Homo-oligomer: A and B are copies of this chain.
């Protein structure tokens, strides 16, 4: 452990943490330096696993994960106070929140050139993970899981493949929340999603069927029919550009119906907090670096997407059969809808183990409830979180914790 990176007194806590936590920089490729925030397991660091958490974007910060999803403490609406999180993932794991790629959040490079792409980011994370274990050698033995959300449906499998090549790293599994596993399935499934969740109506549905579909299959992905395109554009407008919350259809859109924030998302609370000069100091952030933003428009705008589907990577990770994989999805998200990923998993053709069923969670007073549905294969499970959006741990923390706990512990969901 690099002592100088230790986080001493973090502004906004009434009482200091019982666990150690570090914040500093990991070397990536070239002259890139990725900011990390490592929170030790609240229960036996030396025998709790090592979890990498990557938010997606591309261009968005993994400190959103920490501060608004499943970190030990969550920033409150005043931008100043942090409250402990009883459902935090670092209850049972050493969680490494990594701001990536270069330029996102407090991460930078010496040359400041932040145009990048999937292969480069994969390599960058891989090398940063390498640099991590040089700095934290006492965690080289620990079980190592790679987890992410959103565009990290690309970051994570591509990374995992590189990790798979290095047996010094003790990779045991990976989990992806509302991930982007396949643009084609995402896009085709979203359109059904839109109709059957009441956003489209029958004239438009008919048109779509007529122009984009022939008898038992639709192409809403790359269809060249010009009348299909005009309708897909209408769907794109309804879903993404007309007032709905694409991250969570049944939630209000932050700041009425019409720097890069994610859409329908208020990022004030976290930004206010992390730009506090005392917070930057506590987190060993060098002063000269620009303000923190949840996402970087430059990164996102300059980003080159190469992989169109994670089918290879997953089969390549499944062939070995050393690795326990989970894809989970909020079933009211339209950014990466649950069905797209259910189709994606189903189309991996693995040996079915447990048939598709409910899975439960115990609540105070409410008793046991259905948290979602789960379909298991050997080494790979798909699972939904009923009534949760793009950011599962925010919409349903307890369910998210249960899922995660049962994942870490090789247990049935």
Contact residues of A with B, CB < 8 Å?
192-193, 196-204, 215-216, 242-244, 249-250, 252-253, 255-257, 331-332, 338-339, 342-343, 346, 355-356, 358, 360, 363, 366-370, 372-373, 375, 384, 386-387
Contacts and interface: CB of A to CB of B under 8 A. Distances in A.
A234 to B, nearest CB: 11
Contact of A370 (B257, B342, B358): B257
A356 B203 contact: yes
Contact of A356 (B192, B201, B253): B201
A250 B216 contact: no
Contacts of A367: 255-257
A193 B363 CA distance: 27
A218 to B, nearest CB: 11
A387 B250 contact: yes
Contacts of A199: 373
A339 B197 CA distance: 9
B243 A198 contact: no
A256 B366 contact: yes
Contacts of A386: 198, 249-250
Contact of A369 (B200, B253, B346, B373): B253
A146 B200 CA distance: 29
A200 to B, nearest CB: 8
Contacts of A366: 252, 256
B198 A196 contact: no
Contacts of A244: 370
The list of the 8 closest CB pairs from A to B, nearest first, reads A256-B367, A250-B387, A196-B196, A201-B356, A198-B331, A252-B369, A243-B370, A257-B368
A249 B387 CA distance: 8
Contacts of A338: 198
A248 B372 CA distance: 14
A201 B375 contact: yes
Contacts of A387: 249-250
Contacts of A342: 198, 201-202
Nearest to A355: B203
A332 B197 CA distance: 8
A355 B252 CA distance: 24
Given A196-B192, A338-B198, A369-B256, A250 B203 contact: no
23 contacts: A193-B196, A196-B196, A196-B197, A197-B197, A198-B331, A198-B338, A198-B372, A199-B373, A201-B373, A215-B215, A215-B216, A243-B358, A243-B368, A249-B386, A250-B387, A252-B363, A255-B367, A256-B366, A256-B367, A256-B368, A256-B369, A257-B368, A257-B369
Contacts of A370: 242-244, 253, 257
Contact of A198 (B242, B249, B252, B373): B373
B331 A202 contact: no
A370 B253 CA distance: 9
Contacts of A368: 243, 256-257
A198 B384 contact: yes
A250 B250 contact: yes
Contacts of A193: 196
A242 B256 CA distance: 38
A252 B244 CA distance: 24
A346 to B, nearest CB: 5
Nearest to A347: B202
